[PDB]
Design a protein around this ligand. Structure first.
Ligand code: GTP
Ligand code: GTP
Ligand code: GDP
Ligand code: GDP
Ligand code: MG
Lengths: 430, 428, 54, 433, 428
């Protein structure tokens, strides 16, 4: 009817999938077993019986992350094959994931993805979750995206990705692994939602009170954001918004397609019962420069767009009053060629709680995919970082020997250069 | 299904493996004999990375113990975990090298390599995906220094991509067990710069220190020192064995710690090392383990990293812990100490969080640090060689074992090259 | 399809335990097999204890 | 009224027929004694006597008694007629000359006498099903001699072949390419439709589609037994769109010398896997055309699809079949020839296949078997010709053949005739402009 | 209905066959007095290949006992299974051959060959359909090398269409028993290359090397050597004795292994051979069986397969197991070691599997290989022949017994022709 295949790539992806599909299960009441004790159709298919197998393809070159799922609590939910793993990892090297170690799993994946697209009568588009700083998540993702465009045609190939953090950086080759992936995905991705980690760390400490958070808490929040990008596709709402719509009302010029996400009523239970979270309250917070998902200060750019997705009990009148207020304050500035500015999508289903989560059952919530130009600061930091290394030809042997020319690096940084120019041109006001 | 063939070469090597294997066996749960008498399930999930499997639940170690004299290996067999090793992997010779790299690399070491290469293959043949090999050995000897380098060469050719790490024991900055150490080591390093993916450099000197100022041990035995090399060993292979929040691998660690090829000489070190009396007065918290792994004293090599710039760093934290802390306690280092990390590499640290903790411990970590301080080690080994070759001292021994004099100079050059690379980057 | 999966899982376990039973009979037949034991009883002959086997 | 005499020749033919007749016995409720516990649909395979016995309409022939005497002392001892199981004393020993000229010619009179006894017993005979293997001696020599004797005695009666074509890499014999070229050249025009299977593909099917590791020949013969049951399901059971055995030569082979379609069985999944997915008509139709679900080890995208015959069993809807094939034809991944715009034979049956106790298959509501005649089989012949002349250049193993009553010039006659077949496929594989 | 008549000549042939009939009787469940006290009916189903009916459920072997010395008959009757043989089949001479090929072939074996042939036609024509013959002898002796080849010629002029099998024991120089053995071996290979349909070359020093390092025995006697040979005979002919999931008897092995009628000298081996101490260190699987099968160390011939190319390879298996696992392993040994197989044969390895293993075994396999590298076995014998023939060393023993100089010349000429013919097919 209106289904959406979800292709998670890499540890980040596999682990994000775990949180996301757990929420999906406790929303459509599908117990870990896979049964309920047509809103589910979008994400969950169905055997002749009541076994609702998910519509996902968890793929990871390393045989470990997907193995914790194969033998876990949600073991009999996922189909044994959907979980596609390899024998050795991409060793934080785009090359291996896009040329050598990743050129032997692409077949299995595109085959299975086709098998989940033959049961789809209204495939809105594919959701591709991954992290730019990793090998598979950069290499294979780029690989898949290429053949995804040629096989599944022009579909809403959206991508909830994890951009490297301003300061913190798991791997040292992150600059490289993340520039060599934009260059190829720039023309094979519709909306690349950027959600960092150091921002979510800050939220888990300031908004929720969980000090010393783990990737679990961070991943749980990511799931609530993905639940809201796909809540009008499953549940019902006054103003429903489909995946196809976002691309139109968020991506202004083609290349510029890196929106930033934001939740809203992220409060601890002890705080929940101390504030009357109003539609304005949740909206005002969804714009504050400390609840953002990337540490790019939005008070430096111009909201080239905005898509506010209200979920829960949200009277249609308040959403207007709130947006009107935002429009008043001059801090929140929008580019001149966007006089309209916002896109609203109301969904009646209230946000759900996870047995052992962090946020407290709210009555209303808002998620805002915003295309600010303040994301330029991100690539500018990354560009220097890459430049600080390519100059010394550091870690270049780890790529030239894995089916890749040195020329590619330069070619990629020229595309990175172009995007950084475009993001500036679309800023210069009339 | 990654698997690691452990080639223990030489006396030092055969004793290093005897404890390394005992340690990994205690983790996986394999008993002296070889049956799983453990109290978990993940202890048997990924055992294929180190142990094979016979009938009856016996998990024979995938290891080849090599030596040019049976002595040390016969002594290894008659020990604690001395019946796990397969009886057909103890390839031994009858005439030892006698602290002679030559005998070990051209004379008697070259009449055994054939036999070893057979065992090596068989173990590497029964391997779905041999992630790589691992050579624990001494660089101031003959079977460890010579046959070791011979094997690493023949193997590196026969098996390309496969990772090839080496827990090499380099000479000390003070006393010297072997008088011919200068030659032995200098002649070996040259080969360890050409046929090794990542060479870890442990010096006995450091072990004493971390077993006197850290472990308050008054009567340390080489075995207490060997337990330390065995802990560092597991750390670089804990994520390809037990699950984790952020997973790592020998290859991944190599990619994020070998900037330019030639430099593969790292410096190891553990984390929750504490004294017996100073045990109840501790606070196992990521904050604490990250104040030791970086403390120069807790290094396992002579090179002091205050005279050099860390080109990279690799922490492998084994312990269910707060990801935020791991991260927050990493920037702090790169920030606070800001002159001991190169600027040409933005982020100079790799992080991996394996969950299953070291037996009898809550949180540990294994640090491997490529530092331009390692130039100190080769500078010393070279200033010695110089003094010796100048007066052509024990050259005769090496000469008439199928050797020349130009190879000596070649080696010396090769060394001065690596030390030049190191300095260049340090000042770059 | 469910009772087949439980029957196939129990059959594989039963075949694995039957494999271990004749693995132990394999080893036990070697340690007493007149070849590896090297007992001095193959030299016994039909002509008597004195004559032995040449 | 719908009978077919099934000849089983060679060890591959006999051991396949053990799983085939076990499946036929379980389908019609005939015990291994031959007596039903408590209709007339068994007549196509069994012949009921005056008493409750139901003897099969089959002959088991092999030159080596170490396989048939297992049947003569097994569970199905009392099912088979003693005269119907015919053995010699010395095997053909992978010699086509022994199976055709010297040793196999001895046993051809008793087999044809037993075949004509079964044919005289039959009232509605349709065709002969012969199970053999290209890589054997008896399966290549005595099979070939049987075709010459069947053509001279029975005429244009239908003859279907279920042969183990030689795998591209795995082989159990050295002179296996010699027998494969020799038996094909002399069966090119004495055979009407020869269905192809390879052992490597079933090994891959058992590894990736079934959950079982370390597969044996027993799992191979059961999956082949499911195909022949699916081929002959329309004669025995009620069907919405019935398919005869005279059908297969009409709608699969376009030209007289090309009669090697590719058999496959798409819904081959284990019980644990079957719980995790549905088995709809569109899902099983497009699983036939997958290159990974082919029971002949050759890539179907390398060549051109010429004729396809799809047989459906179970609660299958003809509309769902019409929708599934239409989505196949609009797919550009696979392509048909221009001179055959139809390229599809449809067969619908109502009874789902019976699961055998101990089998690796699952209880399925729908089943499909596709017999596809492809141009992509030409790469198998070229590779088989490469193996033939690699030893024929130095006359390797030819002394075993010339020393057993067969001329040397037949090697130079079969390969020249096979080289014509190589570019008979090239001739039909081009479009006309 | 496929009978095999067993022949044996010489002390070596009698002692090997005495152990051979002991192993067969243990497999077929026959007591030393000759009655079937077995368990399975699958044992008493094809007993007719080797044994004959006698009144009262008694089974007599179809073997003839041939020797020129009465001392070997006392040795074969002193064995545990010495009473099973029929006394009419004991054909013993009065004067020994004395390591003389001329006495064994012309003057002393000429009157005994008629008595042997009467017993041979006695046992051959009581079979409804005889498959072939089987001869065990040594090429270094006098009775085995001389009369053994005489029986080969005289039973092939009466049974030409039946297969001929000989289990030859060729001499090896490093374990030398007699001094005149290069003369006996050279004069006997010409009778082997022209008559025998298939032959197996057994080296005593390879049996000793197997008994030293593979089975690890302290004191390996000849009965242990004969046990390794006897297990190979049982493994070769286990197809026509027990059912298999896909079969290969003697003739089908001979078709697929012999490409040209002068190329039938094989290289036998037995797969499941492990030491007592390594019994618990092994996993009884098909990959270990195949890995030890193709090893030159496990080979029963003194010529190393790496020096030549495998023309064809046979693999006869015993036991219940999978076929994909076996079929993939023979695919793996061809693909990795592509330089060790001839290019003009694309499928060098054939496979036989029987579902019944030997008693006391769950799995077993035997290796048959026609390789070019057996030409160095003959070339090292020929260089020991031309060293003696040039100076006419021990030739007055042969010339005075009725043979000429040209027979020695034509024997060496046909022997060098076989080696050169092996060399040409290696070049391809
Ligand atoms: N925000 C967030 N990020 C995560 C989470 N889990 C993993 N990550 C990210 O994943 C990255 C590491 O994953 P990868 O390097 O791709 O590991 P991998 O998928 O095995 O890739 P290879 O090792 O190269 O094969 C880190 O940078 C994390 O930021 C999560 O739950 N939330
Ligand atoms: N389907 C199937 N094929 C088999 C089986 N056993 C062997 N084969 C195949 O059959 C081919 C040879 O046929 P054989 O089984 O040896 O029987 P044959 O054709 O009569 O040949 P011989 O009896 O050995 O002379 C081999 O190449 C195998 O690929 C089996 O049990 N089932
Ligand atoms: N850490 C550690 N070092 C050891 C051990 N045994 C020997 N060594 C070192 O090995 C060096 C000597 O190497 P050597 O004994 O000559 O090895 P060989 O070539 O096998 O003879 C000495 O400098 C020791 O410091 C041990 O158990 N632990
Ligand atoms: N394998 C094996 N070889 C033997 C045995 N007995 C003798 N030989 C070999 O046979 C050779 C001597 O043969 P010989 O007894 O003179 O043969 P004969 O003259 O025909 O009886 C020696 O080189 C031995 O190696 C035995 O029991 N087993
Ligand atoms: Mg057969």
């Amino acid at each position: 009817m209106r289904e959406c295949i979800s292709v998670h790539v890499g540890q980040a992806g596999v682990q994000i999938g775990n949180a996301c599909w757990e929420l999906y299960c406790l929303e459509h009441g599908i117990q870990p077993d896979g049964q309920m004790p047509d809103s589910f159709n979008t994400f969950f298919s169905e055997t002749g019986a009541g076994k609702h197998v998910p519509r996902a393809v968890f793929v990871d070159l390393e045989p470990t992350v997907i193995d914790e799922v194969r033998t876990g609590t949600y073991r009999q939910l996922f189909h044994p094959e959907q979980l596609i793993t390899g024998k050795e990892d991409a060793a934080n090297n785009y090359a291996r994931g896009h040329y050598t170690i990743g050129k032997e799993l692409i077949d299995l994946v595109l085959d299975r993805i086709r098998k989940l697209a033959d049961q789809c009568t209204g495939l809105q588009g594919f959701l591709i979750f991954h992290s730019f700083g990793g090998g598979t998540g950069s290499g294979f993702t780029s690989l898949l995206m290429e053949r995804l465009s040629v096989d599944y045609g022009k579909k809403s190939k959206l991508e909830f990705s994890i951009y490297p953090a301003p300061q913190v950086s798991t791997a040292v080759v992150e600059p490289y692994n993340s520039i060599l992936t934009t260059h190829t995905t720039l023309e094979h991705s519709d909306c690349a939602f950027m959600v960092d980690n150091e921002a979510i760390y800050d939220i888990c400490r300031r908004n929720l009170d969980i000090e010393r958070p783990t990737y679990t808490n961070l991943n749980r929040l990511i799931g609530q954001i993905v639940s809201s990008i796909t809540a009008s596709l499953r549940f019902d709402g006054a103003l429903n918004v489909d995946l196809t719509e976002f691309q139109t009302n968020l991506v202004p010029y083609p290349r510029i397609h890196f929106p930033l996400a934001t939740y809203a009523p992220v409060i601890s239970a002890e705080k929940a019962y101390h504030e009357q979270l109003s539609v304005a309250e949740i909206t005002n917070a969804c714009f504050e420069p400390a609840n953002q998902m990337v540490k790019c200060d939005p008070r430096h750019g111009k909201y080239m767009a905005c898509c506010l997705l209200y979920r829960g009990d949200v009277v249609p009148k308040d959403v207007n009053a709130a947006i009107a207020t935002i429009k008043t304050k001059r801090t929140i500035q929008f580019v001149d060629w966007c006089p309209t500015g916002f896109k609203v999508g109301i969904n009646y289903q209230p946000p759900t709680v996870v047995p052992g989560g962090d946020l407290a059952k709210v009555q209303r919530a808002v998620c805002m995919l915003s295309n600010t130009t303040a994301i330029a600061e991100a690539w500018a930091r990354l560009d220097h970082k890459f430049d600080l290394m390519y100059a010394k030809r550091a870690f270049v042997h780890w790529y030239v020997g894995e089916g890749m020319e040195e020329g590619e690096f330069s070619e990629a940084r020229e595309d990175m250069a172009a995007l950084e120019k475009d993001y500036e041109e679309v800023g210069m006001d009339s | 299904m990654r698997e690691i063939v452990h080639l223990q070469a030489g006396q030092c090597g055969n004793q290093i493996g005897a404890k390394f294997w005992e340690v990994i066996s205690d983790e996986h749960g394999i008993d002296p004999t070889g049956t799983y008498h453990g109290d978990s399930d993940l202890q048997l999930e990924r055992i294929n990375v180190y142990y094979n499997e016979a009938t009856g639940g016996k998990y024979v170690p995938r290891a080849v113990l090599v030596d040019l004299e049976p002595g040390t290996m016969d002594s290894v067999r008659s020990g604690p975990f001395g019946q796990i090793f397969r009886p057909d992997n103890f390839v031994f010779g009858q005439s030892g090298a006698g602290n002679n790299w030559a005998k070990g690399h051209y004379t008697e070491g070259a009449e055994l390599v054939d036999s070893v290469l057979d065992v090596v293959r068989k173990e590497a043949e029964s391997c779905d995906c041999l992630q790589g090999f691992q050579l624990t050995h001494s660089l101031g000897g003959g079977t460890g220094s010579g046959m070791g380098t011979l094997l690493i060469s023949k193997i590196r050719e026969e098996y390309p991509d496969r990772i090839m790490n080496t827990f090499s024991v380099v000479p000390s900055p003070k006393v010297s067990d072997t008088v011919v150490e200068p030659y032995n080591a200098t002649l070996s390093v040259h080969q360890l710069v050409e046929n090794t993916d990542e060479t870890y450099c442990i010096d006995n000197e450091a072990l004493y220190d971390i077993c006197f100022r850290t472990l308050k041990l008054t009567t340390p035995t080489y075995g207490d020192l060997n337990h330390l090399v065995s802990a560092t060993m597991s750390g670089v292979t804990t994520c390809l064995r037990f699950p984790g929040q952020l997973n790592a691998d020998l290859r991944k660690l190599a990619v994020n710690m070998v900037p330019f090829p030639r430099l593969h000489f790292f410096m190891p070190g553990f984390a929750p090392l504490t004294s017996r009396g100073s045990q109840q007065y501790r606070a196992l918290t990521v904050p604490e383990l990250t104040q030791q792994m970086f403390d120069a004293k807790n290094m396992m090599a002579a090179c002091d990293p205050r005279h050099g710039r860390y080109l990279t760093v690799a922490a492998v934290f084994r312990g269910r812990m707060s990801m935020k802390e791991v991260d927050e306690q990493m920037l702090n280092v790169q920030n606070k100490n800001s002159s001991y990390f190169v600027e040409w590499i933005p982020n100079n640290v790799k992080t991996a969080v394996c969950d299953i903790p070291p037996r009898g411990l809550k949180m540990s970590a294994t640090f491997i640090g490529n530092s331009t301080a390692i130039q100190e080690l080769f500078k010393r080994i070279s200033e010695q060689f110089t003094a010796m070759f100048r007066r052509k001292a024990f050259l005769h021994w090496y000469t008439g074992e199928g050797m020349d004099e130009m190879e000596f100079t070649e080696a010396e050059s090769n060394m001065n090259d690596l030390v030049s690379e190191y300095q260049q980057y340090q000042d770059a | 399809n469910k009772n087949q999966a439980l029957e196939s899982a129990e059959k594989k376990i039963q075949e694995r335990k039957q494999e271990q039973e004749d693995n132990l009979a394999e080893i036990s037949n070697m340690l007493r097999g007149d070849l590896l034991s090297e007992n001095p009883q193959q030299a016994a002959s039909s002509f008597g204890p004195h004559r032995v086997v040449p």
